[PDB]
Amino acid sequence: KWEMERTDITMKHKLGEVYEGVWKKYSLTVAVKTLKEDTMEVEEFLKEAAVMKEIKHPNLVQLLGVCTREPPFYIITEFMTYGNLLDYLRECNRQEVNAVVLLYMATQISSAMEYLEKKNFIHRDLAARNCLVGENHLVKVADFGLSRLMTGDTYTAHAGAKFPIKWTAPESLAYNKFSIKSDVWAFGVLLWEIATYGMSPYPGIDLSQVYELLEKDYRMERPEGCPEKVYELMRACWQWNPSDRPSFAEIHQAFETMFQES
Ligand SMILES: CN[C@@H]1C[C@H]2O[C@@](C)([C@@H]1OC)n1c3ccccc3c3c4c(c5c6c(n2c5c31)CCCC6)C(=O)NC4
Secondary structure (H helix, E strand, O other): OOEOOHHHEEEEEEOOOEEEEEEHHHOEEEEEEEEOOOOOOHHHHHHHHHHHHHOOOOOEOOEEEEEOOOOOEEEEEEOOOOEEHHHHHHHOOOOOOOHHHHHHHHHHHHHHHHHHHHOOEEOOOOOHHHEEEOHHHOEEEOOOOOOEEOOOOOEEOOOOOOOOHHHOOHHHHHHOEEOHHHHHHHHHHHHHHHHOOOOOOOOOOOHHHHHHHHHOOOOOOOOOOOOHHHHHHHHHHOOOOHHHOOOHHHHHHHHHHHHHOO
């Protein structure tokens, strides 16, 4: 079990809610995602925990332990000093976080998604804000709440689900069809975030025109200095028809290559 003792953790401050914690026993800083007793995302929070137990990879935030016997409930994970990649990128000195660094981040993230692709997982919410950073530009994928292990190739969202439109693929916006491919789309947009140091996608466009524009075959222009093969991947990631999209194995491979030629 991952079940462990509440009392071992000195709490600290805000980051259901996330808090910086200290596992007394091992002099160690941790993140603890908590749930306030009564409020019934009890279903939905235990599901996150259950998912995290099954996954393990050096580019996925690691479940260290849990308190699910007795409320207040706790998920404990490894701590990532530099927090979310979107604010990291926006706030950073780009001489240090340079062209090649960007390529490593993209490469790490692809590594973890090929892993998820092998296990048949969708993240279903892939984005700069949901990536966390450590020392020496370590990056890991986080926030596994909407992650499912699919039976079959297709998770269908409930109608009147709310999506982050500007990261969501066309078949997901029309028919609520999610899949690995729909995360490929998501990943492509994240590349666009990384390449621009955290600009918001489809800048200046209302949510209510995005789908129509994707249908009439509009895609975000290549951002300043994005490599040619990075932009090529972004564009294959944005194929209307999901069969035409690449795979995470394909993408990672291409990044592995591109990354060593640097
Ligand atoms: C009851 N034991 C804990 C289980 C857990 O978290 C601890 C706090 C403890 O394990 C050493 N832990 C560490 C403490 C100090 C330095 C490194 C680690 C550490 C580490 C890991 C780890 C894991 C678990 N725990 C880990 C670790 C739970 C099961 C999956 C992996 C790990 O994978 N690398 C360092």
